[PDB]
Amino acid sequence: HMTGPMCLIENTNGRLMANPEALKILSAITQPMVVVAIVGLYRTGKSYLMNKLAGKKKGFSLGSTVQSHTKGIWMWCVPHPKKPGHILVLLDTEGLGDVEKGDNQNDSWIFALAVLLSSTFVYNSIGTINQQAMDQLYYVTELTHRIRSKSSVSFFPDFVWTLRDFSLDLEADGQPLTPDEYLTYSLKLKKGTSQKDETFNLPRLCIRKFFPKKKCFVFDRPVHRRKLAQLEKLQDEELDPEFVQQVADFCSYIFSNSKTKTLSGGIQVNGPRLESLVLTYVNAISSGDL
Amino acid sequence: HMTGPMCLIENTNGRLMANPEALKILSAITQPMVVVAIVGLYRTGKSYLMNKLAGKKKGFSLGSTVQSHTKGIWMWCVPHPKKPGHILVLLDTEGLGDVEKGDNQNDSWIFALAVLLSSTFVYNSIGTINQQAMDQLYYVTELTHRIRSKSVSFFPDFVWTLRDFSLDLEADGQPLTPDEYLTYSLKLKKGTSQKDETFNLPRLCIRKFFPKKKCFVFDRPVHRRKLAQLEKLQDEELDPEFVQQVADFCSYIFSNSKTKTLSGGIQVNGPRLESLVLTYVNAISSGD
Numbered sequence: 001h002m003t004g005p006m007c008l009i010e011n012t013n014g015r016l017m018a019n020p021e022a023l024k025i026l027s028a029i030t031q032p033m034v035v036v037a038i039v040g041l042y043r044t045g046k047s048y049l050m051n052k053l054a055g056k057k058k059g060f061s062l063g064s065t066v067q068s069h070t071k072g073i074w075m076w077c078v079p080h081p082k083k084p085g086h087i088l089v090l091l092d093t094e095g096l097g098d099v100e101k102g103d104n105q106n107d108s109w110i111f112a113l114a115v116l117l118s119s120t121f122v123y124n125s126i127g128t129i130n131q132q133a134m135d136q137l138y139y140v141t142e143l144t145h146r147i148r149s150k151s152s153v154s155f156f157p158d159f160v161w162t163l164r165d166f167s168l169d170l171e172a173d174g175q176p177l178t179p180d181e182y183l184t185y186s187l188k189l190k191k192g193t194s195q196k197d198e199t200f201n202l203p204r205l206c207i208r209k210f211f212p213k214k215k216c217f218v219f220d221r222p223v224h225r226r227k228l229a230q231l232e233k234l235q236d237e238e239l240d241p242e243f244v245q246q247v248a249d250f251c252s253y254i255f256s257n258s259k260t261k262t263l264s265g266g267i268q269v270n271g272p273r274l275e276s277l278v279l280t281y282v283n284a285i286s287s288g289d290l
Numbered sequence: 291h292m293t294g295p296m297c298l299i300e301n302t303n304g305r306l307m308a309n310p311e312a313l314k315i316l317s318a319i320t321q322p323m324v325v326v327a328i329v330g331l332y333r334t335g336k337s338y339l340m341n342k343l344a345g346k347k348k349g350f351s352l353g354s355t356v357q358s359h360t361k362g363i364w365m366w367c368v369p370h371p372k373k374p375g376h377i378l379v380l381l382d383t384e385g386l387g388d389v390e391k392g393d394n395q396n397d398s399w400i401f402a403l404a405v406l407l408s409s410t411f412v413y414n415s416i417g418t419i420n421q422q423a424m425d426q427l428y429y430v431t432e433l434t435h436r437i438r439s440k441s442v443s444f445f446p447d448f449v450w451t452l453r454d455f456s457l458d459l460e461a462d463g464q465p466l467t468p469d470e471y472l473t474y475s476l477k478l479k480k481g482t483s484q485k486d487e488t489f490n491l492p493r494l495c496i497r498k499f500f501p502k503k504k505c506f507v508f509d510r511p512v513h514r515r516k517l518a519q520l521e522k523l524q525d526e527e528l529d530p531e532f533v534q535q536v537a538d539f540c541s542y543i544f545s546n547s548k549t550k551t552l553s554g555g556i557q558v559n560g561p562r563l564e565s566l567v568l569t570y571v572n573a574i575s576s577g578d
């Protein structure tokens with residue numbers, strides 16, 4: 001049916017535009033949708049992980065260069081491998097912090113759309129969880145509220161942090177951590193009444209409230225090789241064997257746990273209803289708030 | 291001289307303070323100084339690369355876990371390996387973006403001090419040059435002017451060190467040296483629209499602020515899944531290319547990094563560095 005990805009939201013010269021051809025395809029799919037979007041800094045292996053969710057070696061194209069490759073937001077609608085009669089919709093995004101673009105405002109919009117359109121939202125980083133990403137997640141979360149206002153049980157997405165090229169010991173304060181406990185460690189509140197105790201707390205309170213469920217997975221370097229240039233065409237046997245497992249566990253969690261996308265009121269989102277969200281939210285951005 | 295590093299600027303509960311023991315060591319050193327500082331996100335291999343400048347296996351301690359390890363600003367004064375009668379002062383810094391700390395303002399001060407105190411400033415990142423790193427570098431150079439106001443260029447030279455570098459050095463069909471990658475990342479936009487001007491203004495300020503720039507790439511130090519034992523490994527246990535890239539970095543620092551200088555052209559020795567540390571730490575500890 002849908003034989004490869006297609007640009008859903010174009011990103012050309014500062015302007016975010018819905019692709020009519022993608023909208024057409026969406027308007028033909030009447031099945032309910034599980035929507036999994038991924039965002040993170042550019043050149044962090046996002047497109048590759050998304051191809052795993054499709055069960056394919058190739059799909060969203062990777063790019064082997066210091067330049068950004070994924071632009072705007074791409075979609076790939078494929079049969080949901082565990083829930084009969086559902087469609088799994090994969091949303092692959094333009095990486096954050098491209099120095100060729102140099103446009104933060106534009107980053108925020110893409111980030112925001114990804115959150116607004118998803119039922120599972122995947123934030124992808126290398127090595128560590130880091131405050132600057134947590135600051136940005138919080139900002140975009142709040143912006144998401146302003147966009148919903150401009151038009152106008154929970155229908156906010158569940159949350160996954162994917163840690164790439166993970167090489168450090170999962171320990172803190174003498175104590176081992178699971179990946180999940182590392183995430184909740186990172187969102188832990190300062191006990192104090194004190195003032196700054198409150199500045200520190202407040203973003204964390206907001207992220208914890210916005211995303212109802214949370215999950216964290218670590219991934220080894222895919223390959224031992226010093227270069228990733230040939231990745232698209234290496235079979236599992238040529239990859240690091242614990243990377244392969246880690247990817248399986250991740251996919252299997254997404255397949256088992258990611259909920260059907262839902263409108264406020266509880267109505268389930270299918271093609272025509274996603275098409276109508278895309279336009280609503282792109283129009284709301286094309287206007288003028290920040 | 292110094293058998294190991296020590297804390298120069300402590301960082302406790304939002305307070306940055308000079309270590310009197312460190313100042314006392316500074317005040318005894320009459321020789322002119324080359325000062326190399328390193329900044330970047332936390333857990334990014336900063337302390338390891340600094341130890342290679344000191345030609346020791348162990349030194350600034352690394353730490354194995356997800357938690358930050360280097361706190362505040364540490365110093366290591368060793369004889370300059372290429373300039374007789376000079377001292378090489380290495381400043382290793384608390385990494386940025388620590389989720390345990392969750393204090394951007396503290397990050398800034400540490401970032402500003404490193405810039406203010408150095409004669410070569412090394413900014414260290416994984417994989418790419420990110421715009422978020424550029425944005426903060428701009429922010430901090432401006433802050434720097436503010437701090438200097440509370441009380442022939444003497445601004446440091448600049449080096450971007452790219453870690454775990456795995457991507458093809460190539461942009462728009464054309465192959466890049468690391469240096470051409472840095473200058474590509476600071477390229478200005480043709481036109482003169484509002485948003486051309488916004489894009490340009492950070493890039494103009496960085497390029498003006500740092501007289502010389504330079505860029506190195508480093509492979510992953512090891513192939514092993516985990517970094518844990520990395521204090522202990524010899525050069526033949528490491529990635530061969532990483533060893534050569536480090537040799538090349540070090541030999542660039544040794545050859546090219548200038549003596550630290552005050553405005554008016556006076557060369558900074560221990561007592562003059564001491565007085566800079568106090569001056570800048572007090573200005574931060576006062577009220578903006």
Ligand SMILES: Nc1nc2c(ncn2[C@@H]2O[C@H](COP(=O)(O)O)[C@@H](O)[C@H]2O)c(=O)[nH]1
Nearest residue numbers: 042043044045046047048062063064228231
């Ligand atoms: N460092 C790293 N790069 C990866 C990984 N997976 C794929 N890549 C590379 O990341 C690039 C795509 O990243 P994206 O811009 O989609 O975030 C491609 O070069 C792809 O080969 C990974 O696990 N770690």
Ligand SMILES: Nc1nc2c(ncn2[C@@H]2O[C@H](COP(=O)(O)O)[C@@H](O)[C@H]2O)c(=O)[nH]1
Nearest residue numbers: 332333334335336337338352353354385520
């Ligand atoms: N990913 C990565 N980590 C490294 C590298 N060199 C050393 N490390 C690790 O980086 C951590 C220290 O980083 P720092 O907090 O000083 O920036 C230690 O765990 C050290 O073993 C490197 O080249 N790449």
Ligand code: ALF
Nearest residue numbers: 042043069070095
């Ligand atoms: F750099 Al990309 F998707 F190619 F973030």
Ligand code: ALF
Nearest residue numbers: 332333359360385
């Ligand atoms: F996490 Al560090 F120096 F130990 F930035």
Ligand SMILES: [Mg+2]
Nearest residue numbers: 046047069070
């Ligand atoms: Mg991509």
Ligand SMILES: [Mg+2]
Nearest residue numbers: 336337359360
């Ligand atoms: Mg360190």
